[PDB]
Amino acid sequence: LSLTNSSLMPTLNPMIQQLALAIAASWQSLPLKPYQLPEDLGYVEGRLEGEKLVIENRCYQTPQFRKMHLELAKVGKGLDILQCVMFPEPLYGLPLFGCDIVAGPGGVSAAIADLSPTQSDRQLPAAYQKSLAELGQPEFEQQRELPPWGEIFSEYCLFIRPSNVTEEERFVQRVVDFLQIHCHQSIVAEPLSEAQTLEHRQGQIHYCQQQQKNDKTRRVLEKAFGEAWAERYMSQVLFDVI
Ligand SMILES: C=CC1=C(C)/C(=C/c2[nH]c(/C=C3N=C(/C=C4\NC(=O)C(C)=C4C=C)C(C)=C\3CCC(=O)O)c(CCC(=O)O)c2C)NC1=O
């Protein structure tokens, strides 16, 4: 989580850099252990007939978080990506923190962050609703509508093209606030009942299945590694169904 050894970090979009730092800072003092990705994946790079894709994977776990995944990626010189999901241990019934940032030479094109539900009612737990409302509605000038598979995201989901530096910083601060709420609720959460654990597990499986419908992610992977590799990466590395 010291991103000091990262090859990609110094060359990434500035908003991406600040988000990577914020997420690493949030995780740094947790009771972390490594989480071994399939084939103990770390750094990976590939090219077929076009641009090369490079990805740095970092992945941890704690008793409350089954898998805490931070990816940084670059396609050629034209495209920077940050991806993060904290997959909850269903026993504690926490939502899914997720973030995806895509940037090119012109700036950030997509900034997405959410605390996504795992309950069957598609609602966040009550304490998250209370804490999230207290943050107030952020104003962003260029909102983007989620694609249909995006039904998985909560009403607090951000999906924007930041308009300027003030918006970039506003977005990063909102992600820090979501992380602050989430890490706090993780301390105050109890082991749930076996039926409740099952209901949360089902929500998390649904979230992964829907995230696999994201053809924007899939095409980037396919252009660098091919269809089979991208299928294995999406289903086994990014959005593994437990
Ligand atoms: C290797 C990893 C990886 C790649 C290659 C990737 C690519 C990627 N994801 C994108 C969109 C997106 N990405 C997401 C959301 C997420 N995606 C997530 O992995 C998570 C956790 C969420 C939400 C928390 C959404 C909702 C879109 C918009 C898709 C659309 O417009 O159809 C886009 C389009 C950006 C734009 O329209 O401006 C690209 C190129 N994203 C990645 O993470």
Curated annotation (Swiss-Prot):
The keyword Cell membrane does not apply. GO terms for molecular function: cobalt ion binding; phycocyanobilin:ferredoxin oxidoreductase activity. GO terms for biological process: phytochromobilin biosynthetic process. It is an enzyme of class 1 (oxidoreductase). It comes from the Bacteria. InterPro entries: Ferredoxin-dep_bilin_Rdtase (IPR009249), Ferredoxin_bilin_OxRdtase (IPR022870). Transmembrane segments: none annotated. Pfam families: Fe_bilin_red. Keywords: Oxidoreductase. Its EC number is 1.3.7.5. It catalyses: (2R,3Z)-phycocyanobilin + 4 oxidized [2Fe-2S]-[ferredoxin] = biliverdin IXalpha + 4 reduced [2Fe-2S]-[ferredoxin] + 4 H(+). Coiled coil: none annotated. The keyword Oxidoreductase applies. HAMAP family: Ferredoxin_bilin_red. Catalyzes the four-electron reduction of biliverdin IX-alpha (2-electron reduction at both the A and D rings); the reaction proceeds via an isolatable 2-electron intermediate, 181,182-dihydrobiliverdin. Belongs to the HY2 family. This is Phycocyanobilin:ferredoxin oxidoreductase. It comes from Synechocystis sp. (strain ATCC 27184 / PCC 6803 / Kazusa). The lineage of its organism: Bacteria, Bacillati, Cyanobacteriota, Cyanophyceae, Synechococcales. The gene is pcyA.
